[PDB]
Amino acid sequence: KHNMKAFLDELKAENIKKFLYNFTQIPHLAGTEQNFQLAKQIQSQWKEFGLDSVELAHYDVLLSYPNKTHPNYISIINEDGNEIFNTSLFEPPPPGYENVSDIVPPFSAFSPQGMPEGDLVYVNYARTEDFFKLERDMKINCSGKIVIARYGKVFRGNKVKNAQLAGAKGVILYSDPADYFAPGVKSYPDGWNLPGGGVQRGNILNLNGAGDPLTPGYPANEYAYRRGIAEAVGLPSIPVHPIGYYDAQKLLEKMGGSAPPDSSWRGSLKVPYNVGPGFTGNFSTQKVKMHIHSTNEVTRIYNVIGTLRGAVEPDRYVILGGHRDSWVFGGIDPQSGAAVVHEIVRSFGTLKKEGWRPRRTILFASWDAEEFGLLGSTEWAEENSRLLQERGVAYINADSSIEGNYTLRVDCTPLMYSLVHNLTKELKSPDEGFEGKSLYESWTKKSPSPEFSGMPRISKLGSGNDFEVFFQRLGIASGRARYTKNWETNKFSGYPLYHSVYETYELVEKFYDPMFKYHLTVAQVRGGMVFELANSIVLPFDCRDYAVVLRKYADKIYSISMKHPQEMKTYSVSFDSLFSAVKNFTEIASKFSERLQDFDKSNPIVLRMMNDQLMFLERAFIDPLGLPDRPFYRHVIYAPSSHNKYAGESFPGIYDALFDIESKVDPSKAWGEVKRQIYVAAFTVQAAAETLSEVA
Amino acid sequence: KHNMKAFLDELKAENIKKFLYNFTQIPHLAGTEQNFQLAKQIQSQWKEFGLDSVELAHYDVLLSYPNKTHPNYISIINEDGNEIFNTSLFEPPPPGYENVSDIVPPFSAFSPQGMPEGDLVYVNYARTEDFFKLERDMKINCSGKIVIARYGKVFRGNKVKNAQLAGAKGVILYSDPADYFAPGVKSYPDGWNLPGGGVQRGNILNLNGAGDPLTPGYPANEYAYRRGIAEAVGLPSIPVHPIGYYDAQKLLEKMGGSAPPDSSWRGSLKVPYNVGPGFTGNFSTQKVKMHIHSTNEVTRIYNVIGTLRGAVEPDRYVILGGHRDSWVFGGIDPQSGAAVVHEIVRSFGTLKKEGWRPRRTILFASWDAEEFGLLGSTEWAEENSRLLQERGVAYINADSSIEGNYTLRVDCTPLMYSLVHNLTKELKSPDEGFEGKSLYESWTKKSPSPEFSGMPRISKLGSGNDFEVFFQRLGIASGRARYTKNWETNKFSGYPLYHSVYETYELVEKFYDPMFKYHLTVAQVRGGMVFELANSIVLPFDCRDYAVVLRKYADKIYSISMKHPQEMKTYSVSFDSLFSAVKNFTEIASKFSERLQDFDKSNPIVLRMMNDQLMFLERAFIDPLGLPDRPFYRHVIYAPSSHNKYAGESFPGIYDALFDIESKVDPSKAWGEVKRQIYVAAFTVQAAAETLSEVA
C-alpha cells in the first residue's frame, strides 16, 4: 500500500548521513558560485528523484561581504595612536580544513563602514532591560561610546538596534563562555564547545519581515525599482563586529568605571565585568578603535522550487521549505535540515515512481540567503503572494534538524497541535531508555507541557527563519520541528558552535548524532506532517486548539494591564470585548467541529467548503494594515517580539502598547492606544470566529 | 421551468411603480427615525418575499446635520456690518409637500462651523485645472478669500479639497443654469429642470475609500475605539454651503477684478463672470459672510442584509446592493434603484417558494448612509472583509435606475463585458423605434463604442457609490447599469434635480418613465446579471476582455509619459516591463480560456478550481500596500481619479506620478517615482496573469 507508513519506512538514516557529508565539504555562502553550483545539483537530483518540475527562482538582493584586501578588526590604541592589541583576522580552521578556500572571516553582515574610536561601555546582553538598568538606575550614558555586548538571550539585531537608540557609535559582539561553553565538555575538535578563537557570524538587520532591504513589498526581479541605500529597510547606522572570548578578555580586562550591578551581568571570564565607561586609571588614555570595511552589494540568489502535483486538489499547496546557504560549512545550520529535506523528496519520489500522487500539491523549497535576512523565501513569497494566500494550506520549515540530542522541539500554530500529537504517537522514540516507546511518550516525559499533565511542550512560532513570511505576513498555518537539548538547562542561546567555522560534518557525526537516528526521527516528523497535510481528506487542523490558546493569551495580556489598576479606571480600559470575542470563538469552533465530523462524508463541495474554512482560518488573523510601524507583521495573534526577533509574542499590538507604559509622558494618549489595540484584537478574533460559522 | 426567463418574466413595471411611490412619500435621511422605520419595513417584506434570513446590521458612524434653531446662510454685508442680502433658508417645497415635516434644508454635509467674512473669488468649476489657470496664468491668489464655484464636472469634494489647498477660507457652491437647466424644458413642477430656488445637497468629504471618518480599517461597532475629530479622515477644514442660481446671481452680479479668462468660464446667468477678487468700485467695501452651524454627530445607521442560500456553492456570494437613505424624498436617488431591488427580491423569492434555489448564495443589501460617504456599505465590508475576499464572486450596484430616458449606461469590470453583451442581446428594447429589437441593438446604435463598430460603450467604474469598497478595496468584480441621457449632449453633471427637494415620485412618473418601462429594463439587466453570476455553472467572466483593456491602458499611460521624451532619456524610463506583462497576460488568458472550454466537464474540482481562478482574478489586481497616501484604494488597474472621485482612472499609480510632473522641483525624484509605479504595475499584471496559469 501507498500510505504514510510506506513513506516513513522509505526514509533512511544512512541516506541523510550521505547527503549531509555531500553538502558540507565546502562553504555555501549566499551569492557565491559554490552556492549556485549546489542549487544546480539539488535541482538536478530532485528531478532524478521524480518531482514533476524543478526550477530555479532567482532574485537580485542586497548582500554584505567583508573586503578581502582590507580586513575588519578591532584595536586597543594608546594616546600616541599605536595599535597595541588587534583582534584576530580569522578563526583558526579546524583539522583537515586549514587549506579550504573561501571561508568568509567573521563579520556582522550589513554593518556600515567606519573607524570609530572611543571608550568602551559593557552592556551585558544589550537587551532592552539591560539598557534600562544602565540609563535609568546606574545613570551611565552610552552616547558616543563603543558598546561591548555578549551574545545570547535575544537576536543580535535587537542588540544593535538597542545600542543605536542609546547613542552608541559602535558595537562589539562577543561569545562569553558562560553562554557558549558547557561545563565538562571539550572545545572543538575534541568536543562540541566553542574555542576561544571561535566567532559567531550573523546579520544585524532589523527588517521586521521586509525581505530584501531595497524592495519591500515586491520581488527583487530583473525590472525592480530599488530604494537608495539611505531609504533601505533595516540597515544599522553604526559599525558592528563579532569576536571570540580570547579577544574579548583582552578588551574587557582593563575596564574601569562602575562595577557590574549584580551577578547576572557577570559571565565566566576572569575579568571584573565593570560597566565603564573606559579603562581603569593606568590605561585611561587608551581607547578602542574599530576598523570595518565590509560592503553592501546587490547580488543574485537562487531558490530551488520542486513541485509534486496533487491528484485531486492540485490547487492546494503544502510547502516544505528550508535554506541552503550557510555561513561556512553549515554542518548543522542548515545542512542537517537540507539533508533531511533531500531524503524526504527522495522518499516521496519513490512513491510517485510507483504511481502514487498526494491528494494536494506539495512544493519543496531550497531557499537562498536566509542568513542575510530570510531574503530568498521572502522574495519568492512576495512574487507568489496571490497564489499563496488563495491556495496555501501549510508551511513546514526545515532548517537545522538538531540543536541538541535530548528530545523533540516543536513550534507551530495551534492548528497543528492535534496533528503533531497524533503523529508522534505513531513514531518510534530514538531515545536511550525509551526503546519500543513512542516519540510522544519520550517527548512528553522529557519536555512536559507547563499547563497539562500527559502532554508535551509546543512553543509559539517566533521568527529568525524562513517561515516568517508565510506565517506572520501571509497567514499560512506554519510549523517547525527538530531535536533539542534539555529545556531545564536550556539558557536560550543555542548550541556553542552556532555560525562558526567549527560547524562541520564531523561535529555532527562525532558529537551530536553518530547513528543519524535523531535526524531520521526529525525526517519522520517533518515528512509525516507534510504527508498528512497533503493527503488527509479533511485538513488535519483543529480550530478548538486555537480557542484554548486565545483564552490563555487574553488572560496573560489582561494580567499585564492589571498591574496599572488606577490607569485602567481613569481611562476606562476594558478587556470585555476581547474576552467576549474569545468566548464566541470557542462556541463557534465547537459547533464547526461538530459539523466537520457530522457532515455528509459523500459531498465534496461540503468537504471543499469545510477544507477552505480550515485553510482560511489562519488567514483570518491577518490585518491588512499590519502592526504599528511593522507593516509586514500582519498576524494579530502572533508577531516576533519587538525586543527579540526569535521569541513569539501573543497579542503583540496590545503587548507593545502596554510595554513600559508608566514611562510615557502622555498617559491619555498611551492608554488610548492600548484601547485601540484591544478593539483591533477583539474585532480580529470575532472576524476569525465568523469564518467558521455556517456560510449562508 | 425555473430558468432566467422565468425570473425575468416575473418582474413587473407596475410593482416597481408601487414600490417607488411607497418609498418616496416622506424623507429618509440617514440616521433619522423614518429611515430606521423604512429599514424595518424592508426587512419584514424581504422575509415575506421568501429570503432565508434577513437581518439588520447597525453601526455608529459620524454624520452631519444643520442646526434646526441656528440656520445656515450666506450674506452680503456692508462696511457698517449690516446684512443687506441673505441667501434662502430652505427650498420652496413642491406642490402638495409644503406641509411635509423634516425636510433637511440645503447644506454641505461635514462642513465645519464658522462665520468667515471676505472677498469673493470665482473659480469656475473649482477643478485642478481651474486653479492652475487662476494661480499660474492669471496670478490671482485665493489665500484668505471666499471662493464661489459652480457645481458640475467633478465630485464636489474635490472642489473643496482644491479650494482648501489654494488657501480659501470658505467655499460657496451653486448650480448654474448652464449645467442644470436644459434648454426648452420647464422648471419643476412643470418639467424636469432646476428652479432658481432649487439647491443640490451633498457631502464634501475626501475619504479615499475610508468609510466612517472615525474608524478607518475597522467596523464602527459597539466597542470601536474612535479617532478624535482632529485625526478623522477626510473632513474639510473650511466652511462650505450650497445655493441656488437666484441667490448666486445676487453674489456674482457685483463681482469685479479680472474678466473671465475665456468663454469656458462663463455660465448662463446675466452676470459678467468676473473672477474678482471682490466687487466693483461702488461695492468694493461690501464683503461676503458665511454662517455655518452644522454639527458632526456619531449616529446609528442600519443596513438590511438578506440571504438566499445557494444549493450547490453556498460559500460563494453574489451581492446585489443599493442604498436606502436619501437627501429628501429620493424619487430618483436612490429609490428608483431600491424599488428595482425590491422587485428583484420579490421575483427571486417567487422562484424560491416553488422549490428553486440558485447555485451560489445571493446576498441582497439595502445600505444606509451612502449619501454621507458610502458609510453603511463600507462599514459592513470592513466587518465582513475576510468572508468577502475569500467568497465574493461579484457585486452589482443598484442606486438610481434612471438619470435620463435615452439609452442604457453600463460601467463595470472588463470581466463582465461578455456577460453584459450576451444578456442585453436576449432582452427587449424599451425604446421608441426599436419595438421588437434587442436592448443590445438599441444600446449599440445610441451609444456606440468609441473603439469597435457594432459594440456598445461600457465605461470604467469610477466611484461615488457603494461598489467602491467591494471593487477598489477588496477586488471583487463589480458593475452597475441604469438608463441615461444622450452621451452626445451629456455634459457630465447628471440630471437637473439631483439631491434637490424636487426629486419626487412625480418627477419620475410624469417626466422620466410614466410606464416604468425603463425601470423594468434596468431590473432585467441588474437581475439578469445577478441570476447568471449566481447560477451559471462556469462563472460568466471572460479574462481575455481584461487583456484587451490592459493593452489600451498601457498604450494610454505610455503616451502620457512620451510627452516628456528628454526626461525619459535622462532617467531611463522604460515601459517595456509593463508591455511585457500585458503580452504575457494576453497569452496566459488565451490558454486559460482554451482549458475552460476544453476541460473535463464532469469534474467538479477542475470546475471549482477554474471557478476560483476566475473569482480570484479581480482579486489579483489588489496591492495590499495600497496606492500612495490612499491605503484603501488597493486596485492597481483602477482607482477613482485624484481630481474627480466620480471618474475612473486607469494605472492610477503611474498616472498620478506623471501628473503635472514638469512642475516638480526635483525631477530625478519625480521620475524615480514614475519608474517605481511602472514596476508595481508590471509586477501586478504579471502576478495576475500567473493566477491563470496551470496551478501545478
Ligand SMILES: *[C@@H]1O[C@H](CO)[C@@H](O[C@@H]2O[C@H](CO)[C@@H](O[C@@H]3O[C@H](CO[C@H]4O[C@H](CO)[C@@H](O)[C@H](O)[C@@H]4O)[C@@H](O)[C@H](O[C@H]4O[C@H](CO)[C@@H](O)[C@H](O)[C@@H]4O)[C@@H]3O)[C@H](O)[C@H]2NC(C)=O)[C@H](O)[C@H]1NC(C)=O
Ligand atoms: C459575541 O457574540 C454575541 C452574539 O451571541 C455578540 O452579541 C452582540 O453584542 C452586541 C454588543 O453588545 C449587541 O448589540 C446590541 O444590539 C442591540 C439591537 O440588537 C437587535 O437588533 C440587531 C440589529 O440592529 C440584531 O443584530 C440583534 O439580533 C438584536 O435583535 C442594540 O439595541 C444595542 O444598542 C443599545 O445598547 C447599547 C449598550 O447599552 C448602547 O450603547 C446603544 O446606544 C443602544 O442603546 C446593542 O448595539 C448585539 O445585539 C449582540 N448580538 C446578538 C446577541 O445576536 C457579541 O457582540 C460578540 N462579541 C464580539 C466581540 O463581537
Ligand SMILES: *[C@@H]1O[C@H](CO)[C@@H](O[C@@H]2O[C@H](CO)[C@@H](O[C@@H]3O[C@H](CO[C@H]4O[C@H](CO)[C@@H](O)[C@H](O)[C@@H]4O)[C@@H](O)[C@H](O[C@H]4O[C@H](CO)[C@@H](O)[C@H](O)[C@@H]4O)[C@@H]3O)[C@H](O)[C@H]2NC(C)=O)[C@H](O)[C@H]1NC(C)=O
Ligand atoms: C513575461 O513572460 C516571460 C516568460 O515567457 C518572462 O521572461 C523572463 O524574463 C526574464 C527577464 O528578462 C528572464 O530573466 C533572465 O533569466 C536568465 C536565466 O534564465 C534561466 O534560468 C532561470 C532561473 O534562474 C529560468 O527561470 C529560465 O527558464 C532560464 O532557463 C538570466 O541569466 C538573465 O539575467 C542575465 O541577463 C540580464 C539582462 O541582460 C542581466 O541583467 C543579468 O545580470 C544576467 O546577465 C535574466 O535574469 C527569464 O529567463 C525569462 N523567463 C523565461 C523566458 O521563462 C518575462 O519576464 C515576463 N514579463 C514580466 C513582466 O514578468
Ligand SMILES: *[C@@H]1O[C@H](CO)[C@@H](O[C@@H]2O[C@H](CO)[C@@H](O[C@@H]3O[C@H](CO)[C@@H](O)[C@H](O)[C@@H]3O)[C@H](O)[C@H]2NC(C)=O)[C@H](O)[C@H]1NC(C)=O
Ligand atoms: C487525532 O486523533 C484523534 C483520536 O483518534 C482524532 O479524534 C477522533 O476523530 C474521529 C474521526 O473524526 C472521531 O470519530 C467520530 O466520533 C463521533 C462520535 O463521537 C462520530 O459521530 C463520527 O462519525 C466519528 O466516528 C473521534 O471522536 C475523535 N476522537 C477524539 C476527539 O477523542 C483527531 O481528529 C485526530 N486529529 C487530527 C487528525 O488532526
Ligand SMILES: *[C@@H]1O[C@H](CO)[C@@H](O[C@@H]2O[C@H](CO)[C@@H](O[C@@H]3O[C@H](CO)[C@@H](O)[C@H](O)[C@@H]3O)[C@H](O)[C@H]2NC(C)=O)[C@H](O)[C@H]1NC(C)=O
Ligand atoms: C457569450 O455568448 C458567446 C456566444 O454564444 C459565448 O461564447 C461561446 O461559448 C461556447 C461555450 O463555451 C463556445 O462553444 C465551444 O466551442 C468549442 C469549439 O469552437 C468547443 O470545443 C466547446 O466544447 C464549446 O462548444 C463557443 O465557441 C463560444 N463562441 C464564441 C466565443 O463565439 C460566451 O462564452 C458567452 N459569454 C459569457 C457566458 O460570459
Ligand SMILES: *[C@@H]1O[C@H](CO[C@@H]2O[C@@H](C)[C@@H](O)[C@@H](O)[C@@H]2O)[C@@H](O[C@@H]2O[C@H](CO)[C@@H](O)[C@H](O)[C@H]2NC(C)=O)[C@H](O)[C@H]1NC(C)=O
Ligand atoms: C595591529 O595592526 C596594525 C595594522 O596592521 C595592518 O592591518 C593588520 C590587520 C594586518 O593586515 C597588518 O599586516 C597590516 O599592517 C599594526 O599597525 C601597523 O604597523 C605597521 C608595521 O609596523 C605600520 O607601518 C603601520 O603604519 C601600522 N598601521 C596602523 C594603522 O597603525 C599594528 O602593529 C598591529 N599591532 C599589533 C600589536 O600586532
Ligand SMILES: *[C@@H]1O[C@H](CO[C@@H]2O[C@@H](C)[C@@H](O)[C@@H](O)[C@@H]2O)[C@@H](O[C@@H]2O[C@H](CO)[C@@H](O)[C@H](O)[C@H]2NC(C)=O)[C@H](O)[C@H]1NC(C)=O
Ligand atoms: C439677514 O439676516 C440677518 C440675521 O437675521 C436672523 O437670521 C435670519 C437667517 C433669520 O432667521 C432672521 O429671522 C434672524 O433675525 C438680519 O439681521 C438681523 O436683523 C435683526 C432685525 O432687524 C437684528 O435685530 C439683528 O441684530 C440682525 N442680525 C445680524 C446678525 O445682523 C438681516 O436684516 C437680514 N437681511 C435682509 C436683507 O433680510
Ligand SMILES: *[C@@H]1O[C@H](CO)[C@@H](O[C@@H]2O[C@H](CO)[C@@H](O)[C@H](O)[C@H]2NC(C)=O)[C@H](O)[C@H]1NC(C)=O
Ligand atoms: C555531491 O553529490 C553529487 C551528486 O552525486 C556529486 O556531483 C556529481 O559528481 C559526479 C562526479 O564528479 C558527476 O559526474 C555528476 O554529474 C555530479 N552530479 C550532479 C551534480 O548532479 C558531487 O561530486 C558530490 N559532492 C561532494 C563534495 O562529494
Ligand SMILES: *[C@@H]1O[C@H](CO)[C@@H](O[C@@H]2O[C@H](CO)[C@@H](O)[C@H](O)[C@H]2NC(C)=O)[C@H](O)[C@H]1NC(C)=O
Ligand atoms: C408602504 O408599504 C408598507 C407595506 O405595505 C406599508 O406598511 C404597512 O402598513 C399597514 C397599514 O398601516 C400595516 O398594517 C402593516 O404592518 C405595514 N407593513 C409593514 C411595515 O411591513 C406602508 O404603510 C406603506 N407606506 C406608504 C407611505 O404608503
Ligand SMILES: *[C@@H]1O[C@H](CO)[C@@H](O)[C@H](O)[C@H]1NC(C)=O
Ligand atoms: C577593498 O579595499 C581595497 C584596498 O584596501 C580597495 O582598493 C577597494 O576599493 C575595496 N573594495 C571594495 C569593494 O570596496
Ligand SMILES: *[C@@H]1O[C@H](CO)[C@@H](O)[C@H](O)[C@H]1NC(C)=O
Ligand atoms: C548623553 O550624552 C550627550 C552629550 O555628549 C547628551 O547630548 C545627552 O543628552 C546625554 N544624555 C543623558 C541622559 O544624560
Ligand SMILES: *[C@@H]1O[C@H](CO)[C@@H](O)[C@H](O)[C@H]1NC(C)=O
Ligand atoms: C549526545 O547525547 C549524550 C547522552 O546524554 C550526551 O552525553 C552528549 O553530550 C550529547 N551531545 C550533545 C551535543 O549534546
Ligand SMILES: *[C@@H]1O[C@H](CO)[C@@H](O)[C@H](O)[C@H]1NC(C)=O
Ligand atoms: C444649535 O443652536 C442653538 C441656538 O442658536 C444652540 O443653543 C445649540 O447648542 C446648538 N445645537 C447644537 C447641537 O450644537
Ligand SMILES: *[C@@H]1O[C@H](CO)[C@@H](O)[C@H](O)[C@H]1NC(C)=O
Ligand atoms: C498668497 O497670499 C498670502 C498673503 O496674504 C501669501 O502668504 C502667499 O504666499 C501668497 N501666494 C502667492 C503665490 O502670491
Ligand SMILES: *[C@@H]1O[C@H](CO)[C@@H](O)[C@H](O)[C@H]1NC(C)=O
Ligand atoms: C423622456 O423621453 C422623451 C422622448 O425623447 C423626451 O422628450 C423627454 O425629455 C425625456 N425625459 C427626460 C427627463 O429626459
Ligand SMILES: [Ca+2]
Ligand atoms: Ca522584495
Ligand SMILES: [Ca+2]
Ligand atoms: Ca470603519
